């Protein structure tokens, strides 16, 4: 597993031939009420790539703007 | 197993490109980083290997050949040396005195090292314990302890 912090690099991986799925995890923050922390994970042939989003609106914008041939998985 | 120490000495191959290794009984005084010279024309100095027919009377030698080309058999135990005592008038013969006191005539082309064998004086410390002698012969051969004959039965 590997972590990414730069959204440009995250988007570059999302368009490569052997990326097969995305994982959307939704979770309430622990310190306080609702901060709906979100993590987005890409499944390539060799590693998972996880990016952590503190802003719900930004995460919501990024995920629907993904290519429509990636199978989507929701754990919560 | 041996009382004396060994020197590891490196010569440079003369019939090909490369280096070669020798193990030689070391004489008392040798040090790491020293150059020694072996041959019929080498100078007279401690650690060099010379034919015994080019050494003056009185020289102390060790690690001697009793025949030329033999690669050394006679004076080898720690603290031991020999003495050149006489030279033949027509060459061809050299007389020495062996550590046991015997006198012996050798071909004058045989080789030897100048100096005495190192680590001399090791029979002056009392062994003082049975275990010390157990450790001494543990690395030599199975010859210890010894039961004496008068304490056995006649069959054996």
């Amino acid at each position: 597993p590997k972590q990414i912090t730069d959204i440009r690099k995250f988007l570059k991986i999302s368009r490569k031939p052997d990326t097969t799925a995305v994982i959307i995890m939704k979770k309430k923050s622990k310190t306080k009420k609702n901060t709906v922390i979100t993590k987005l994970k890409l499944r390539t042939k060799k590693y998972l790539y996880t990016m952590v989003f503190a802003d719900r609106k930004k995460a919501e914008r990024i995920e629907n703007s993904l290519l429509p041939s990636l199978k989507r998985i929701y754990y919560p | 197993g041996r009382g004396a120490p060994l020197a590891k000495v490196i010569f440079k191959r003369t019939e090909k490109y490369g280096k070669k290794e020798e193990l030689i009984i070391a004489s008392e005084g040798m040090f790491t980083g020293q150059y020694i010279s072996c041959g019929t024309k080498a100078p007279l100095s401690v650690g060099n290997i010379l034919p015994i027919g080019k050494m003056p009377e009185g020289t102390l030698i060790c690690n001697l050949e009793h025949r030329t080309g033999n690669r050394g058999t006679l004076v080898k135990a720690s603290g031991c040396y020999a003495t050149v005592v006489g030279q033949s008038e027509d060459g061809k013969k050299t007389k020495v005195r062996l550590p046991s006191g015997a006198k012996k005539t050798i071909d004058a082309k045989a080789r030897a090292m100048v100096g005495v064998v190192g680590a001399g004086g090791r029979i002056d410390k009392p062994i003082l314990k049975a275990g010390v002698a157990h450790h001494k012969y543990r690395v030599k051969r199975n010859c210890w302890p010894k039961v004496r004959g008068v304490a056995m039965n006649p069959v054996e």
Binding site: - | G3, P5, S27, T59, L60, S78, G118, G120, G121, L128
Partner: protein, 85 residues
């Protein structure tokens, strides 16, 4: 305070082996455990590592010597004879 009158080093042998043997052991092991001058680097830091090998703690040169001392008179005499010539 001074912990011992006579035996000094050989106090580790207790009462065994007889007094004269312990005396000879003391004479030998005073020499065996001393420090010697390294004529190459000038410091007095040469100590025995095995029954015939002596090594300097500073410059790390190895010299072949005697069994309980760095030099022996019989070799000193022969070397001096040759150097005189």
């Amino acid at each position: 305070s001074r912990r011992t009158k006579k035996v000094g080093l050989t106090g580790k042998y207790g009462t065994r082996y007889g007094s004269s043997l312990r005396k000879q052991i003391k004479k030998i092991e005073l020499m065996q455990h001393a420090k010697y001058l390294c004529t190459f680097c000038g410091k007095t830091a040469t100590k025995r590592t095995c029954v015939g090998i002596w090594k300097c703690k500073k410059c790390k040169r190895k010299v072949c010597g005697g069994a309980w001392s760095l030099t022996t008179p019989a070799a000193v005499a022969a070397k001096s004879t040759i150097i005189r010539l």
